[PDB]
Design a protein around this ligand. Structure first.
Ligand SMILES: [Zn+2]
Ligand SMILES: [Zn+2]
Ligand SMILES: [Zn+2]
Lengths: 103, 41, 79, 881, 95, 221, 100, 101, 122, 144
């Protein structure tokens, strides 16, 4: 399932703050439901402090509109290129700007 | 069990307290207590 | 005739069959007349309270029994 | 065939009338429509997207929004209950039971009722829907009066359902709806379901009349039955009313007897009607009333025997069978001369109707033979000359053992036939049937043998018959297929009736067992071990202990199994060996048997755990000297992991094993183990060691567990404090009168428990004070109880059910120990308090004290002075001598 | 209110009262039943009946208004018949 | 010593088949007495005679010869006395003698007869019958003794004799305290006693099975 | 019982019918649901002990093995001299477990 | 053949909004005769239709071979409506013999 | 009651196929040496030829017996059919039970003793 | 319909108990008579409060428990604290080692001292009368 509520998310933040970065079984040994891989997925998806999960701008959108036309797929390829780096916020921006261009 | 003292609120486990740092911000409502402590900024 | 008076017995939450208990909106005269009937049944149930009440007057036992029996209907008075 | 009027009367509103080729694919206009609605709540099936179609669009409530959406959020509730996760189910159920007065009766019932009309349901879904129905019946009293018929046409096929639990639930919900809606609404509702052409709804409506008559009593709607049984326009109404009488008589047992005569005076207007069905069901109603009476009212059926006699003389067919059922049920109610005359001049009809081909008449005469031969009338040679030879000729077949109502009735008649005639006369006629190639027929013969030999005995069986029955039951034991245990109890009853007379049979049977105990390991091994556990008793009473010593060292190491179902029977056989034989004289001694039991203890199968810890408890109270004193300390840690087993027999035996362990090796080392079992986070592991703290408190002497139990409250954890309080509760509950010295020691703990902020400490402390008040009653310890009730009494105001029933138990326990006077003084100046929330609770506390001890309050009442009109002074106690 | 002057069914006949009640229930609900005629029959079998229970059981079938005038017509005929030693109401003594 | 639970008054059939224990209010319990083949007493389940809002003044057993046993008791309804505040409804709520017949064939208790009293009685007296005499109950009341027996026998009333000019009667009544039944195997009499100690010799003499008249006389002090 | 509050007792008059308990509920009290200190036999009515309902357990309705008892805590509180404590209904327990 | 299935009905979900009248008549008269259609007014039911026929085999031909068929670019699904309720029962109809059979 | 014996004889065969009963003790060794079968619930429009045509699938009936009434009637509903072999009666009671011909359903049972004019249950 | 606290104070012979909520009862005279009866205790003060009577005890941290002297003179407290301090230092390897290879004789004090402490040396605690009802604070009013 992986509902990933905030009470486990802040514990995972404290566990990354104390132990380390490539140290995952020792911090997944204290969550009662999750393994190392799903914690890796959320921490490289939502809990890294370099993730710009808000403040959508103008320059990155006009960058990605003729970058999602170079390749229609491969959103995780262009995720270090944009700098948004969440790899799912780009999909939300793409479908939202295509809903706004159709309406 | 855990307790926030200015909050006067209970928390059953650890993550119940350490997610209570963003909601019902009385930590900015201690500005009135700081103004009572010192009349100037 | 009657109008909207059809309240039958209802959900048996506790089956309060015991008379003299009372409920939340019980008035004063109800629990007082149950108190006086309970006192009269305590008088006639015990032989000794009957003896103590038969010492003062010169009445017999059955006279005091029938007097305290006929005073079970309306001991206090009209509502 | 439909017209437009019926067509728009059927549908609801909200509608109006009015090789090949290859090119490409193209970019669409985002065809991603919401096929499944906006969330995760359940999954939605394709048959549920008609009734639950309306959540598929997002509401966003504006400009299309009356109050009505609040009365149809219940669509989402039924969605989240019917296919959702059980936390979501119970959340939606509590929410709809809290707002059932707010939703109403219109939208709620017209969305619930057509859901169960669909033919694609599930039994769990129907159970959840009737759970919604009877949990909204508690809140919707006196509001469901027009909607009775639409409920019943949905409910009714639950009464004829195949499973028994759904029938019980249907009877309960129709009884609750009858108590909610009254009587005249039910009669005015279910009246046009009598003249209907469908026999399903007519039979089930008659059953509905029967269950509402059992709910609301007989003479409230007895004029309805008297009305419907004597109308002459169609025979269906009289058939329905006599069917109502029949299901009333078979539904409620003996409370129909005081209203028997006023019910039976109806029934003689039948039996002479021109319809065969009406006469047949009238005979069935007389039979049902005779079965219900048992044996009262024989002078009330006196107007019934003459048309029954005329019908068994002149009529034949199913009417003869119903008349014979009625007479055979009436004759046990009757005095000896008249019942003997009705018995001796009916057996010719029974011998004539033994040639009947139909199975139902076979069942009827099979029930008639039971009750018509048991009192005084028929003798031995009469039956064994002409009644039983056609009985063994025509009824002991294979088709009658298949139907269970015919399977049980044959043996249930054969029991009374063996009571009347004898043992070997029946058995020696069916002893050769134990070698048949049919399993169910041999099971019927085995049930016949076990019931005859358990009721009568075995003295009538001679030496010319016992080897036949022993060889037959051994051959039946060798070739059984199913996992039934009726043959096991049959063999046990046979060997218990034999006793000493089975002495030239035990080597053959035990050799058959010892060869049988391998048998491919295709799960035929638990039967041999259970057979040893049954034959453990009879070999000690036959003076045989050498073969016990032979098989003890066999079952000592046939417990190295991988099958738990075999290992449980092995442990049960070894348990029976340890029971029937003295423990210090067994060839697998306790010195090396319990260490072989210790790896078996780490098996998480419930039967293995049960038999293992029962044998461990038998060793712990009768063999505690065969160890090195280190084993009872290393198994009590494993007995912590032996918990959280869901049978309640393991969890009630293991605390006794803890108690006898502490009786063996002292209550100072297992004590720290039982206190370390109090930080688990899981239930069924902290209360099951709480009981173990109680058992170590009560088996060996006190003052060995109490200082550390006082000490553990200083540990700042919730679970250990709740555990020590509940252990004090079970402690005083188990000791009773021995708490007269320890009340003053735990009173400073109970004042801190009742002083504590959490309500769990206060409800456990109320349980402690309750069990203490029930323990020190009559000993002169009323001061500490009056101290603790001063802290119990502010906890009355809590609204949680567990804490209010805990403090109510504490109040009704302290009612007797310190006296009803202090309880009444605590009740005073709180009776007429204007806040209703304290008022009704103090009145019901006064009701509990009033019903608990009424006369003790007579000396405890205060004085109430007179008003202007009435006399409120008890003048009798006022004067003196 | 008016249904409380206590009665005694031993002072009244029964077979002269049944076709009048049959004609009245023919007038009220339009057609003919036989279960309600036997309802009135079985509730007038007892010597001390309950008029309020009769009113509830006839309010259940009917609208609620028809049972009012039905009781208000069925009651004074029973009173006028039980005051007489014969047991016939004034609607049938004259006609 | 409650109002609800029985124990206050007791009655038994003189043949020894049933026994009724009775409270003041709302319940009267009936046990059926039998004997099985060890010459041993057996008692069945308690039968119910519940009657809510009803007082019980005194219960007695009626002697019947191999008939369903009957228990006579004085009952009084008080719901119209408590629901009406006018006071006069509590003045015309006179006593009702009620007969409870135990059908041993049907195993229940039913209210068979309930006849009112224009006077107020305190306790009752069993009259032996069957093949002995006019089986019934005698009702003692203030200045009166009453015979009632159902069916055809009317209410025979006899005023209680007072003394000549004794100085104890401003307005007072006069009741009994004792019954003292006796059967001398030729006739049967009652040595009744009033509250002053005057024994009354009550003797029934009937020409038919119907009662003709009752009579009594001063016996002793 | 006290564990499931939706269970109601029969509460009618008690006769001479001795109550029974099954092998799963042996030793259990009816009111307080305890195991220790038995004092008083259980008397139930004739309607709850009739026909197929004889030899039947009080709580679960299974086949009875041992006799039923009251505790001394129910004895001195006189919860044995009330109506017959036969559990009639069965709701939300051992019913939905059959469907699961 | 098939008793336990109600007929004379067909439920249509995910209908295009551009239906003036004609395309439902074309599709549902291509397969045979028709009784009528029902078009909703609620913006949920706008795009959800009922249709009643005159023949059973035409309804089977629609349902067994129209599931998963592509139309104007909002693909539809078919179901069987369950007739369970009404709003007013009809009365005072004569329906006499009238010398017909 | 008139057609629940169809369900009873069907549940017998369902219990036989559920418990796994071999053919030596599957209810047909008790009715040996008899090719007679009883019919129940036949409509009144059936002649003897149509009964022969509908029950000659597993073998021709050697001896037919319809219940023709004396003077005023034509039929009652019962029938006796005597085949050649007893296994034909086995297959007829196992296969021709539960079917319907023009409305009312029919039932097949065994006779095993002798033909009777009226003893059975209508 | 409801006479106020003025007449309900003037008519009653004991006016020192009547409150402002006593007017809104259904029979105030017998209410203030049972408020002036001899040995009754009052209703606790939280029928009108909204704090559930103990949820205002948030920030006050109390000591866990004060043991009495006849338990502290047995030596169970020091041994219990010593074994807890020994147990908190253990890892799961040791807690599984002495689970299956246990050591005994840890406390092993005696049998007679507990007998003499709970039977001979029994200390009578400080109890109170029936009229001492428990309100919210009740320990910060030790000034009396
Ligand atoms: Zn049980
Ligand atoms: Zn108990
Ligand atoms: Zn019962």
């Amino acid at each position: 399932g992986g509902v990933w509520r905030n009470t486990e998310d802040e514990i995972l933040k404290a566990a990354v703050m104390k132990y380390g970065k490539n140290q995952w079984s020792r911090i997944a040994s204290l969550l009662h439901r999750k393994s190392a891989k799903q914690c890796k997925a959320r921490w490289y998806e939502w809990l890294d402090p370099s993730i710009k999960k808000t403040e959508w701008s103008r320059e990155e959108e006009e960058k990605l509109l003729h970058l999602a036309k170079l390749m229609p797929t491969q959103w995780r390829t262009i995720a270090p290129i944009i700098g948004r780096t969440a790899a799912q916020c780009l999909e939300h921006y793409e479908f939202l700007l295509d809903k706004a261009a159709q309406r | 069990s855990y307790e926030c003292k200015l909050c006067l609120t209970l928390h059953n486990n650890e993550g119940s307290y350490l997610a209570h740092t963003q909601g019902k911000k009385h930590q900015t409502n201690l500005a009135r207590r700081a103004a009572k402590e010192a009349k100037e900024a | 005739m009657t109008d909207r008076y059809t309240i039958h017995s209802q959900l048996e939450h506790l089956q309060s069959k015991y008379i003299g208990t009372g409920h939340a909106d019980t008035t004063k005269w109800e629990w007082l007349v149950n108190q006086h009937r309970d006192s009269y049944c305590s008088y006639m149930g015990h032989f000794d309270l009957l003896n103590y009440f038969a010492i003062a007057e010169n009445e017999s036992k059955a006279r005091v029994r029938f007097n305290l029996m006929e005073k079970m209907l309306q001991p206090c008075g009209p509502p | 065939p439909l017209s437009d009027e019926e067509l728009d009367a059927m549908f609801p509103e909200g509608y109006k009338v009015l090789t090949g080729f290859h090119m490409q694919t193209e970019d669409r206009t985002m065809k991603s429509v919401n096929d499944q609605p906006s969330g995760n709540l359940p999954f939605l099936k394709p048959d549920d997207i008609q009734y639950f179609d309306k959540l598929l669009v997002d509401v966003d409530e504006s400009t299309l929004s009356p109050e009505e959406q609040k009365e149809r959020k219940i669509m989402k509730l039924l969605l989240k209950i019917k296919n959702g996760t059980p936390p979501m189910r119970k959340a939606a159920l509590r929410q709809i039971t809290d707002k059932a007065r707010e939703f109403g009766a219109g939208p709620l019932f017209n969305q619930i009722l057509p859901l169960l009309m669909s033919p694609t349901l599930e039994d769990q879904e129907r159970h959840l829907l009737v759970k919604v129905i009877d949990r909204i019946l508690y809140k919707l009293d006196d509001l469901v009066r027009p909607y009775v018929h639409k409920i019943l046409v949905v409910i009714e096929p639950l009464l004829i359902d195949e499973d028994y639990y759904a029938r019980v639930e249907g009877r309960e919900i129709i009884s609750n709806l009858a108590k909610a809606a009254g009587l005249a609404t039910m009669i005015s509702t279910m009246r046009p379901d009598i003249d209907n052409m469908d026999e399903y709804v007519r039979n089930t409506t008659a059953r509905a009349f029967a269950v509402v008559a059992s709910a609301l009593g007989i003479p409230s709607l007895l004029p309805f039955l008297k009305a419907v049984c004597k109308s002459k326009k169609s025979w269906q109404a009289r058939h329905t009313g006599i069917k109502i009488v029949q299901q009333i008589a078979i539904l409620m047992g003996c409370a129909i007897l005081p209203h028997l005569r006023s019910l039976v005076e109806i029934i003689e207007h039948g039996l002479v009607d021109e319809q065969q069905k009406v006469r047949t069901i009238s005979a069935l109603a007389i039979a049902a009333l005779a079965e219900a009476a048992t044996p009262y009212g024989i002078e009330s059926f006196d107007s019934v025997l003459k048309p029954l006699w005329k019908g068994i003389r002149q009529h034949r067919g199913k009417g003869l069978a119903a008349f014979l059922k009625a007479i055979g049920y009436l004759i046990p109610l009757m005095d000896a001369e008249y019942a003997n005359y009705y018995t001796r001049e009916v057996m010719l009809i029974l011998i004539r109707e033994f040639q009947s081909p139909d199975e139902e008449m076979k069942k009827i005469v099979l029930k008639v033979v039971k009750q018509c031969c048991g009192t005084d009338g028929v003798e031995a040679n009469y039956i064994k000359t002409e009644i039983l030879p056609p009985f063994f000729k025509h009824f002991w077949q294979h088709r009658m053992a298949l139907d269970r109502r015919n399977y049980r009735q044959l043996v249930d008649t054969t029991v009374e036939l063996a009571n009347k005639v004898g043992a070997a006369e029946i058995i020696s006629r069916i002893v050769d049937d134990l070698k048949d190639e049919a399993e169910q027929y041999r099971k019927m013969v085995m049930e016949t043998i076990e019931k005859i030999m358990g009721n009568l005995g075995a003295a009538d069986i001679d030496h010319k018959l016992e080897e036949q029955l022993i060889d037959g039951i051994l051959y039946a034991f060798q070739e059984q297929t199913t996992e039934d245990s009726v043959m096991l109890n049959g063999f046990g009853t046979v060997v218990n009736a034999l006793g000493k007379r089975v002495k030239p049979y035990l080597p053959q049977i035990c050799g058959t067992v010892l060869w049988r105990l391998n048998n491919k390991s295709a799960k035929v091994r638990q039967q041999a071990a259970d057979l040893i556990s049954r034959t453990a008793v009879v070999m000690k009473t036959c003076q045989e202990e050498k073969l016990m010593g032979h098989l003890g060292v066999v079952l000592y190491e046939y417990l190295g199994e991988e099958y738990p179902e075999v290992l449980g029977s092995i442990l049960g056989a070894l348990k029976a060996i340890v029971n029937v034989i003295g423990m210090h004289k067994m060839t697998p001694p306790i010195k090396d048997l319990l260490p072989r039991l210790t790896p078996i203890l780490k098996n998480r199968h419930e039967k293995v755990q049960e038999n293992c810890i029962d044998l461990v408890g038998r060793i712990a109270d009768r063999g505690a000297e065969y160890v090195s004193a280190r084993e009872w300390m290393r198994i009590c840690f494993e007995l912590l992991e032996l918990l959280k087993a869901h049978k309640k027999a393991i969890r009630r035996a293991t605390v006794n094993t803890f108690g006898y362990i502490a009786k063996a090796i002292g209550p100072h080392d297992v004590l720290a183990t039982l206190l370390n079992n109090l930080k688990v986070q899981e239930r069924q592991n902290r209360v099951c060691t709480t009981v173990a703290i109680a058992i170590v408190a009560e088996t060996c002497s006190p003052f060995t567990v109490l200082p550390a139990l006082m000490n553990e409250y200083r540990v700042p954890e919730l679970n250990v404090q709740n555990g020590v309080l509940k252990s004090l509760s079970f402690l005083f509950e188990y000791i009773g009168e021995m708490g007269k010295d320890y009340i003053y020691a735990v009173t400073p703990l109970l004042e801190d428990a009742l002083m504590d902020r959490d309500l769990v400490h206060r409800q456990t402390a109320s349980a402690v004070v309750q069990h203490m008040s029930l323990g020190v009653y009559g000993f002169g310890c009323e001061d500490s109880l009056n101290h603790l009730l001063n802290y119990v009494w502010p906890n009355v105001f809590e609204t949680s059910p567990h804490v209010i029933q805990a403090v109510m138990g504490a109040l009704e326990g302290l009612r007797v120990a310190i006296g009803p006077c202090r309880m009444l003084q605590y009740c005073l100046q709180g009776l007429f308090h204007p806040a209703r929330k304290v008022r009704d609770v103090y009145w019901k506390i006064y009701n509990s004290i009033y019903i608990g001890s009424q006369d003790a309050l007579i000396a405890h009442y205060p004085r109430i002075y007179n008003d202007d009109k009435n006399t409120y002074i008890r003048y009798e106690l006022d004067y003196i001598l | 209110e008016c249904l409380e002057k206590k009665v005694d069914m031993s002072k009244v006949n029964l077979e002269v009262i049944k076709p009048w009640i049959t004609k009245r229930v023919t007038e009220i609900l339009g057609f003919e039943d036989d279960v309600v005629i036997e309802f009135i029959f079985n509730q007038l079998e007892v010597k001390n009946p309950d008029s309020k229970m009769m009113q509830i059981n006839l309010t259940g079938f009917l609208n609620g208004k028809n049972a009012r005038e039905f009781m208000g017509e069925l009651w004074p005929l029973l009173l006028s018949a039980q005051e007489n030693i014969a047991g016939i109401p004034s609607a049938f003594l004259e006609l | 010593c409650r109002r609800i639970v029985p124990g206050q008054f007791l009655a038994v059939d003189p043949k020894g088949r049933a026994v009724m224990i009775s409270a003041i209010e709302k319940q009267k319990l009936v046990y059926i007495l039998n004997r099985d083949a060890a010459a041993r007493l057996t008692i069945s389940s308690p039968l119910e005679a519940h009657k809510a809002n009803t007082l019980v003044y005194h219960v007695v057993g009626v002697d019947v010869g191999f008939e369903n046993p009957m228990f006579a008791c004085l009952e009084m309804d008080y719901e119209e006395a408590d629901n009406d505040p006018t006071g006069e409804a509590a003045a015309n709520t006179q006593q009702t003698l009620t007969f409870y017949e135990l059908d041993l064939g049907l195993n229940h208790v039913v209210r068979k007869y309930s006849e009112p009293l224009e006077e107020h009685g305190n306790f009752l007296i069993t009259v032996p019958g069957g093949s002995d005499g006019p089986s019934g109950v005698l009702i003692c009341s203030e200045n009166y003794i009453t015979y009632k027996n159902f069916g055809d026998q009317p209410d025979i009333r006899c005023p209680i004799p007072r003394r000549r000019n004794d100085l104890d009667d401003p307005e007072r009544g006069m009741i009994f305290v004792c019954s003292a039944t006796h059967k001398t195997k030729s006739m049967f009499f009652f040595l009744a006693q009033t509250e002053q100690g005057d024994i009354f010799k009550i003797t029934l003499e009937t020409d038919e099975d119907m009662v003709t008249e009752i009579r009594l006389k001063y016996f002793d002090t | 019982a006290k564990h499931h509050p939706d269970l109601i007792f029969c509460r009618k008059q008690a006769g001479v019918a001795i109550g029974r308990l099954c092998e799963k509920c042996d030793g259990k009290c009816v009111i307080c649901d305890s195991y220790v200190r038995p004092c008083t036999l259980v008397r139930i009515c004739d309607e709850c002990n009739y026909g197929s309902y004889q030899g039947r357990c009080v709580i679960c309705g299974g086949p009875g093995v041992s006799d039923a008892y009251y505790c001394k805590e129910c004895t001195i509180q006189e919860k044995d001299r009330d109506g017959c404590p036969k559990i009639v209904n069965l709701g939300s327990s051992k019913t939905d477990l059959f469907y699961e | 053949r098939l008793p336990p299935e109600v007929n004379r009905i067909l439920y249509i979900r995910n209908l295009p909004y551009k239906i003036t009248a004609e395309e439902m008549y074309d599709i549902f008269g291509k397969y045979g005769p028709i009784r009528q259609i029902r078009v909703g007014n609620t913006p949920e039911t706008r795009g959800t239709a009922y249709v009643v026929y005159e023949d059973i085999f035409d309804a089977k031909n629609a349902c067994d071979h129209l599931s998963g068929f592509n139309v104007c670019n909002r693909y539809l699904v078919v179901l069987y409506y369950n007739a369970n309720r009404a709003f007013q029962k009809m009365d005072t109809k004569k329906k006499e013999e009238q010398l017909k059979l | 009651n008139p057609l629940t014996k169809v369900k009873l004889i069907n549940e017998l065969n369902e219990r036989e196929v559920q418990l796994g009963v071999a053919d030596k003790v599957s209810w047909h060794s008790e009715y040996k040496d008899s090719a007679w079968i009883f019919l129940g619930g036949l409509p009144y429009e059936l002649t003897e030829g149509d009964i022969i045509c509908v029950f000659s699938q597993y073998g021709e009936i050697v001896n037919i017996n319809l219940v023709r009434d004396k003077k005023t009637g034509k039929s009652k509903g019962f029938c006796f059919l005597c085949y050649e072999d007893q296994r034909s009666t086995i297959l007829a009671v196992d296969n021709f039970n539960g079917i319907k011909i023009k409305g009312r359903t029919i039932r097949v049972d065994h006779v095993s003793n002798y033909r009777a004019p009226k003893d059975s249950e209508e | 319909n409801r006479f106020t606290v003025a007449e309900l104070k003037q008519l009653v012979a004991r006016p020192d108990v009547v409150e402002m909520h006593d007017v809104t009862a259904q029979d105030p005279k017998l209410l203030v008579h049972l408020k002036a009866t001899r040995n009754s205790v009052p209703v606790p003060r939280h029928w009108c409060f909204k704090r559930k009577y103990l949820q205002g005890k948030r920030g006050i941290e109390k000591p866990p428990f004060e043991l009495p002297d006849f338990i502290k003179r047995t030596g169970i407290q020091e041994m219990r604290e010593a074994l807890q301090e020994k147990e908190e230092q253990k890892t799961m390897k040791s807690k599984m080692r002495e689970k299956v290879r246990p050591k005994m004789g840890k406390i092993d004090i005696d049998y007679q001292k507990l007998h003499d402490a709970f039977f001979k040396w029994q200390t009578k605690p400080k109890l109170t009368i029936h009229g001492d009802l428990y309100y919210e604070g009740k320990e910060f009013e030790t000034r009396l």
